[PDB]
Amino acid sequence: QTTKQFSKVVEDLYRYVNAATGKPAPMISDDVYNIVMENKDKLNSAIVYDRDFQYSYFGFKTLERSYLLRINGQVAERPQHLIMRVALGIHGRDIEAALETYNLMSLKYFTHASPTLFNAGTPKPQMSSCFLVAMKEDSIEGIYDTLKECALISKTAGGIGLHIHNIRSTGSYIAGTNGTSNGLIPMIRVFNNTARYVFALYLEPWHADIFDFIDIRKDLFPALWIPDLFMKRVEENGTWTLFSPTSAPGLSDCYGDEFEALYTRYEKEGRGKTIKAQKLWYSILEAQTETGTPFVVYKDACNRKSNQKNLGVIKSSNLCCEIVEYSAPDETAVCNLASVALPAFIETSKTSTYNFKKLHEIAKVVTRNLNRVIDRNYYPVEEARKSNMRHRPIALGVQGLADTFMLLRLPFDSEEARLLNIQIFETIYHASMEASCELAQKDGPYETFQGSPASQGILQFDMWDQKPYGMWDWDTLRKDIMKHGVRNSLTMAPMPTTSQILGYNECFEPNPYLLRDLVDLGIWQYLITQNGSIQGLPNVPQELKDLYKTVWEISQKTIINMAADRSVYIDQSHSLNLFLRAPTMGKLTSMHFYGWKKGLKTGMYYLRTQ
Amino acid sequence: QTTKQFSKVVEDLYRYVNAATGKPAPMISDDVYNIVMENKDKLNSAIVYDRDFQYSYFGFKTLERSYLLRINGQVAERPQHLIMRVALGIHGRDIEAALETYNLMSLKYFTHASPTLFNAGTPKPQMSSCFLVAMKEDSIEGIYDTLKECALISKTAGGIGLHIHNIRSTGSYIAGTNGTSNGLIPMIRVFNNTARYVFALYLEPWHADIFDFIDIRKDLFPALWIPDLFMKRVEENGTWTLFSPTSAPGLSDCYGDEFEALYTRYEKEGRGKTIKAQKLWYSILEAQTETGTPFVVYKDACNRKSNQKNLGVIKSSNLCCEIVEYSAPDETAVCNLASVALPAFIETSKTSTYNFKKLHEIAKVVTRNLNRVIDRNYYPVEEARKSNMRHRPIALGVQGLADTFMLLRLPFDSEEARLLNIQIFETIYHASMEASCELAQKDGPYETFQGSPASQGILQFDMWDQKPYGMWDWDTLRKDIMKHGVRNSLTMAPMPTTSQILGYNECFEPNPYLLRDLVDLGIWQYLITQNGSIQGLPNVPQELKDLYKTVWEISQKTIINMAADRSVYIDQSHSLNLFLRAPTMGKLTSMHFYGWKKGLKTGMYYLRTQ
Ligand SMILES: O=[N+]([O-])c1ccc2c(ccn2[C@H]2C[C@H](O)[C@@H](COP(=O)(O)OP(=O)(O)OP(=O)(O)O)O2)c1
Ligand SMILES: O=[N+]([O-])c1ccc2c(ccn2[C@H]2C[C@H](O)[C@@H](COP(=O)(O)OP(=O)(O)OP(=O)(O)O)O2)c1
Ligand SMILES: [Mg+2]
Ligand SMILES: [Mg+2]
């Protein structure tokens, strides 16, 4: 039902005309069309079409419905065509690199984020996953400049984090009108309507519109950017002060002890309205219980622990709370994502082993890829191009961590899983910093490298004051970095995940593996009825009950521990979903404080409840 | 309850501090504060406070609730203070002119529009009534540039006309996304939401989103910008074609025979969807019957008959449909309004007479005033400053035409009213062109004067191919204009009307006069019950029944005739409200065609129904 020869499919996509209007509407960039034609025989023959059968039914259907390019509503592209299109869009004239990427992706060692699959090699190749936007100014002009920026970004793929800390709250004076402002909520309604026409919102809990903000969902997502001081006041059952940004300037522009001093001074001066810390705390947990939101990200852990700290104060994260990157009125941070497929590295050796050397190597390939994406990307707005070109941050993720544990017969909560978790992330961090250091030797370091923690030999685990696990040699890597720099300000931000296309469990959270096991025990409607849980089931061995636990069945304390463990290797943050069976204000509270005290940057992304 | 000395009130307003914030918030401009202080004795003594009693209870309460400046929620200003503030804000250092304006307004010979009363002499002296905005481009960028412009305008006083003819309709192709647009309605929702956060919409009936557009109200107001060709196709029961602007470029950029040729050619080429003219006609009348809208303004009469025709094609009117002024992406036309109080010129001479010589003189005073307003105005956006400074259009209105007829014992539909109507408007047009010509001798003509109909000796009544009534000498005026120019591209746009402050009937449509008459006949609850109509009432003389008819009782054909009569003296348009007792599709249709055939620019503003 589809043309086989790749160059021919490229021809059709390139020559496409919209019949209804008579308008030529090429679906491939000139740049990539030319490259294919000059490389025709090399490219057509490199492709192995049997690999289209490496997809699950769910996997292929996802690709078919969305990703495979279509002509007149008919799918033109085979999966292998998409992969090669993507490889070429990323690598351009470097055919050797394109073929390597083609092979590794086609054999499913790694994949690239959705926007890359959609747009790579097309005329508006917008390959990036999200954008972190700063509210430009607290004025109608700045608000409408920001709104326009967001409309333009919305024309492309990708989500938007937007921090609003600087907008004056309800009842704040307006010199112009001698009137008072109606605050954040009606401004948010403007942004929501613009999103519909063509979104994660970030706010610090001292903002005087906070109680309304967190109730937004009772589609924009509220996320709290939480200073440590708030959590201390809550713990101690103390007071908390709400300020309009205009009566307490600069709070979002400092963190840690500098913030606490400035904040405490503003409290003393009677610049705001004082309440009981736990009053707001209670409202937050109430909103989370009912809506899944607000998200929780710890502003102080994010800033103290960022290799971008030399740029200034980081004011937000993104929709999925994995991205921690600097943003300002003239700079919109960009998310460039790809994920390694963790099970691809499992090897027989009767026992199964994990090949860390090969994971290291694939992680280095993806790192180089994401750097090419930065350079070949189509930027929807100038703020985003400026940001990416200056600090060149990337975000490597993973998928199939759960799958990996299961294939290797490791219960998620086991000592063996705990160790593998740590090893996998040390490897990927080391690999990506090694590849990035190599690129710095070739192309130079990123523009802002000098004065960064990494230039001083401080890597991520150093900022957690921990020693690395030591599977790789960090001292040599660190010597090289201090000498040559790295090409990327940041490297890792394991994300939500593309994971359904590769047929693996969405990462990084906890069934063909279970099924194969029931087959081998001959047992072969419970799971439907009991929702995929095998505990409390009479005929199944303890070993399967231990291996096959459901995320509702796994201790959130273990999830939080494992996240704390891998976080020493993570430049950015990562999405922590939390699952509560029988949600209680007390249990939620302790989940938050536990993650907080572990030093987590992202305390919670979504709260999923029974 | 209020300080008497004007300079002292000015002092208080100037020195005002917002207590809650500790912020100085002066309510008078530096410029005007200084002028008052240097003129202190002259200004304080010029004021006559007995004149505060010249207001009706309804009149004064309107002023008090809104216009009189307040300090801490307390009214600081007496009406006389407001009038002098306004006089000074308009005239600046010209004290002689300020005193003349002070006297005439305080004796109620004329007034200025609401924004002028509000803001004259304050720090952001935005004295203009509305703004005619062009949609910048048919793109997300142009749409959001326009949205920002409108938000900024919305911070000040004044309404917005916005013409959207250039935005592509539902199902139109978008090269960028290979998708299709959702057209005007969701774009309009964006503008509506922006209006709420911080509106008349203009569309030609060939636009393919037209059926949804006219149903908008079934607060933004749809108004039709109607070519003659539409009305002919309707009359003849012919076809009508709907185009997306993108499939039929340029239709809004020509009018008259040029339009008909281009339109007919696009029809022949099958660029659109053909329907029956009366299908759309029917939907329009249905919308008007139920909502009062869409408004009807005739695009060809507006353009063929405009002294601004040398600028390009006029694409819209304003909210009240009196303003006909050129607008483009870089130029936002501005409405500068003031109204003459028509009854002030009634004089005893047992009979009452009308003093046309004094009306002439007051009309010249207001003309000079409105020119000062142009120069001293605070412009919210640069497009508006550019427009006003280049073409310097003004709009003189009237109020109390109905009052005038009644004081003089003239039934509205009488031959005597018909003549007075014509004389009053000839006088005001002549006066304003005489004053404007005087200013051109002093300051030069407006920048675009050369090549205009007026530079060729073509005045408004010439473009109706009529001879003026001849109460004033037009030949001398016309000779002077061709020689010296005029300072203003346009002069008259009688508006909605400020008419409740002066205690006169809202103009120009059809009771102390009735009451005084019942008193004199000794008759002294009917009117409540019967809604102010004296017909069908046994004890009242025919002469009163004839004089005191209610607008529901007056022939709309007479209203339309009288409007056609005064329209030869009107540079711009004027608001024609229509009243239907027992509304029928047939009667509405004939009302439209009758006005259309009379050559009216504004066919209908609001339709008011039983
Ligand atoms: O003028 N308005 O009609 C107006 C002005 C400001 C308004 C709103 C509705 C909301 N705001 C918010 C938007 C900003 O958060 C803040 C200040 O906006 P601004 O600076 O543009 O307002 P100005 O009237 O120009 O006052 P300022 O000059 O002190 O800031 O007020 C309306
Ligand atoms: O890209 N989008 O997601 C997008 C693009 C345009 C959109 C909408 C929703 C409405 N429109 C309207 C707004 C304009 O009336 C018209 C074209 O807008 P544009 O030029 O900005 O769109 P492009 O995708 O840049 O296509 P173009 O380059 O042919 O105009 O389409 C969404
Ligand atoms: Mg400001
Ligand atoms: Mg375009």
Q: Which class for A501: exposed (0-12), middle (13-18), buried (19 or more C-beta within 10 A)?
A: buried
Residues β-bridged to residue B240: B275
For chain B, state the CA radius of gyration: 25
Annotate A255-274 with DSSP letters as a single string. Answer: -HHHHHHHHHHHHHTT-SEE
Q: How far apart are CA B310 and CA B572, in angstroms?
A: 15
Distances A291 to A94, A159, A216, A231, B288 between C-alpha atoms, Å = 48, 20, 9, 21, 44
Nearest partner of B186 among A143, A195, A155, judged by Cα = A195
- Copy the structure tokens of residue B293: 């809208």
Distance CA B354, CA B110 (A): 16
- Of the candidates A347, A370, A351, A371, the one whose C-alpha atom is nearest the C-alpha of residue A359 is A347
What b-and-e string marks burial along B505-541, b requiring 16 or more CB atoms within 10 Å of the CB?
bbbbbbeebbeebbeeeeeeeeeeeeeebbeeeeebe
> How many Å lie between the centroid of ligand 4 and the Cα of residue B201?
23
Task: Count H helices and E strands in chain A, helices first.
Answer: 25, 22
The reply to whether omega before B508 is within 30° of 0 (cis) is: yes
Helix (H) or strand (E) holding B41: helix B40-46
**Per DSSP, what are the bridge partners of residue B174?**
B179
Task: Report the candidate in A334, A329, A313 with the shortest Cα–Cα distance to residue A142.
Answer: A329
B421 labelled catalytic? no
Give the total residue count for chain B. 610
Q: What is the DSSP letter of A455?
A: G
Are B206 and B263 in contact by the 8 Å Cβ rule? The answer is: yes
Backbone angles phi, psi at A233, to 5 degrees: -55, -40
Across B194-217, b (16+ Cβ under 10 Å) vs e yields: beebbbbbbbbbbbbbbbbbbbbe
Question: What span, in angstroms and rounded, lies between the C-alpha atoms of B337 and B348?
Answer: 30
DSSP type of residue A347 = E
Distances in whole angstroms, Cα of residue B102 to Cα of each of A170, B82, B370, B500, B530: 40, 10, 15, 19, 42
How many angstroms separate the CA atoms of A571 and A323, rounded? 9
Other residues' Cβ atoms within 10 Å of the Cβ of residue B587: 14
CA dist A288 → A282, A514, A605, A607, B134 (Å) = 10, 33, 10, 6, 45
> How far apart (Å, rounded) are the C-alpha atoms in residues A274 and A271?
9
* Token digits of residue B348: 């005893």
B239 reaches A (C-beta below 8 A): no
- Reading the block at residue A454, the tokens are 């990494």
Give the C-alpha separation, A282 to A211, whole Å.
Answer: 11
CB A155 within 8 A of CB A124: no
SS percent in chain A: helix, strand, coil, step 5: 45, 15, 40
DSSP per residue, A195-246? HHH--EEEE-TTBTTHHHHTTTT---EEEEEE-HHHHHHHHTT-EEEEB-TT
Distance CA A550, CA A510 (A): 7
What tokens were used for B550? 């209610």
d(CA A250, CA A263): 9
Contact B472, B430 (CB under 8 A): yes
DSSP-based three-state secondary structure for B5:
coil
List phi, psi (to 5°) of B16: -50, 135
Backbone angles phi, psi at B300, to 5 degrees: -70, -45
Q: In what order do the strands lie in the sheet with B333-335?
A: B333-335, B130-134, B159-163, B200-203, B221-226, B295-298, B602-604
Instruction: Delimit the domains of chain A by residue range.
Output: 1-610
B320 is catalytic: yes
Cα–Cα nearest to B199, from B143, B164, B159: B159
DSSP-derived secondary structure letter, B158: -
Residue bearing tokens 């090669």: A84
Q: Among candidates B567, B579, B605, B254, which has minimal Cα distance to B425? A: B567
Chain A contact present for B178, CB below 8 A: yes
CB atoms within 10 A of CB B562: 21
Distance between CA atoms of B387 and B374, rounded to whole angstroms? Answer: 10
Q: Do A152 and B140 touch (CB under 8 A)?
A: yes
**What backbone phi and psi angles, to 5 degrees, belong to B231?**
-65, -35
Give the number of other CB atoms < 10 A from CB of residue B155.
Answer: 17
The H or E element that residue B608 is part of is: strand B607-609
Inter-residue contact B444 to B485 (CB < 8 Å): yes
Q: What are phi and psi of B355, to 5 degrees?
A: -95, 105
- Measured from the Cα of B182, ligand 2's closest atom is 10
Contacts of B147 in chain A (CB under 8 A): 144, 147-148
Q: A54-92 burial by CB neighbour count: b if 16+ within 10 A, else e? A: ebeeebbebbeeebbbeeeeeebbbbbbbbbbbbbbbbb
| DSSP helix/strand/coil, B397 | strand
For B148, which of A23, A148, A196 is closest by C-beta distance?
A148
Q: Which two tokens stand for residue A198?
A: 């063509």
Contact criterion met (CB below 8 Å) for B457 and B447: no
Please indicate if any CB of chain B lies within 8 Å of the CB of A189. Answer: yes
A79-91 vs A356-376: helix crossing angle, rounded to 10: 70
Query: For residues A110 and A339, is the Cβ–Cβ distance under 8 A?
Result: yes
- What is the identity of the amino acid at A374? I
Whether B239 lines ligand 2, by a CB cut-off of 6 Å, is: no
Check if A27 contacts B (Cβ < 8 Å): yes
- State the DSSP string of B447-472: TT-TTSGGGGT--HHHHTT-----SS
- Pick from A401, A439, A406: nearest CA to A422: A401
Q: Are B226 and B298 in contact (CB under 8 A)?
A: yes
Residue A542 burial (CB count, 10 A)? 8
| Partner-chain contact A148 B144, CB within 8 Å | yes
H helix or E strand, kind and range, residue A341: strand A337-341
B339 residue type, one letter? S
Q: Where are the beta strands (DSSP E) in B19-158?
A: 23-24, 70-71, 74-75, 110-112, 130-134
B298 token code pair: 């005739």
**How far does chain A reach from its first CA to its final CA, in angstroms?**
45
**CB-based contacts of B341, cutoff 8 Å, min separation 6:** B108, B109, B110, B111, B398, B399, B400, B502, B504
Q: After which residues is chain B broken (C to N over 2.5 A)?
A: 198, 218, 349, 497, 510, 524
Interface contact A148-B151, CB threshold 8 A: no
- Resolution, expressed in angstroms to one decimal: 2.3
Contact across the interface for B152 and A144, Cβ inside 8 Å: yes
CA-CA distances (angstroms) from residue A312 to A227, A445, A558, A568? Answer: 16, 19, 34, 22
Alpha carbon distance B159, B333 (integer Å): 12
- Name B337's bridge partners: B395
Buried b (16+ CB within 10 A) or exposed e, A130-159: bbbbbbbebebebbbbbbbbbbbbbbbbbb
Segment (H or E) for A185: helix A184-197
From A193, which residue of chain B is nearest by alpha-carbon distance? B190
List strand residue ranges (DSSP E) for B273-342, in order.
Answer: 273-276, 295-298, 333-335, 337-341
- Cα A100 to Cα A86: distance, rounded to the nearest angstrom: 12
Mutation test of ligand 1: which of A135, A136, A139 has the most ligand atoms closer than 8 Å to its C-beta?
A139
CA separation for the pair B568, B424 (Å, rounded):
12
CB A579 within 8 A of CB A556: yes
* Cα dist from A509 to A353, A549, A578, B15, whole Å: 21, 12, 9, 64
> Is the link from the previous residue into B249 a cis peptide, with omega within 30 of 0?
no
DSSP state of B272: S
The strand pair at A239-242 and A273-276 is best described as antiparallel
How far is B245 from B166, CA to CA, in rounded Å?
6
User: Taking CB atoms and an 8 Å cutoff, what residues of chain B touch A177?
Assistant: 155
In Å, how far is A526's CA from the nearest CA of chain B? 45
Q: What φ, ψ does residue A508 adopt, rounded to 5°? A: -100, 5
Residue A541, burial from CB neighbour count under 10 angstroms (0-12, 13-18, 19+): exposed
**Degrees to nearest 5, angle at CA B601 with B599 and B606:** 120
With an 8 Å Cβ cutoff, is A173 touching chain B?
yes
Taking the CA atoms of B440, B446, B450 and B455 in sequence, report the sign of the dihedral they define: negative
Strand A179-180 and strand A200-203: pairing?
Answer: unpaired
Measured distance CA(A183)–CA(B432) in Å, rounded: 47
> SS3 for B215-271, per residue?
CCCCCCEEEEEECHHHHHHHHCCCEEEEECCCCCCCHHHCCHHHHHHHHHHHHHCCC
Residue B335 annotated to the active site: no
Distance CA(A550)–CA(A532), nearest Å, equals: 7
Residue B393 Ramachandran class (φ > 0 left, ψ -120 to 50 alpha, else beta): beta
- Output the CA–CA distances (angstroms, integers) from residue B474 to A321, B84, B426, in the order listed: 76, 35, 10
Select which of A322, A325, A383, A509 is catalytic: A322
Instruction: State the CB neighbour count (10 A cutoff) for residue A255.
Output: 24
- Coil, strand or helix at A338: strand
Which residues are bridge partners to B604 per DSSP?
A: B296
- DSSP secondary structure letters along A90-139: HHTT-HHHHHHHHHHHHTTSEEE-HHHHHHTTSSS-----EEEEE---SS
Name the strand (E) or helix (H) holding A151.
Answer: helix A140-154
Strand, coil or helix: what is A355? coil
Residue A396: in which H helix or E strand, if any?
strand A395-399
Count of other CB atoms within 10 angstroms of residue A474: 20
Q: Is B316 annotated as a binding residue?
A: no
Rounded Cα gap, residues B481 and B90, in angstroms = 26
Phi, psi of B318 (to 5 degrees): -110, -170
Q: Which two tokens stand for residue A248?
A: 């307490």
CATH number of B1-610: 3.20.70.20
Full DSSP string of B560-600: HHHHHHHGGG-SS-----EEESS--HHHHHHHHHHHHHTT-
Report d(CA A197, CA B190) in Å as an integer: 7
CA atoms within 13 A on the CB side of A9: 23
Breaks (C-N over 2.5 A) in chain A follow: 198, 218, 349, 497, 510, 524
Give the Cα separation of A545 and A549 in Å (integer). Answer: 6
d(CA A477, CA B561) in angstroms, rounded, equals 92
Minimum distance, in Å, between the CA of residue B185 and any CA atom of chain A: 10
Of B407, B425, B455, which Cα lies nearest the Cα of B574?
A: B425
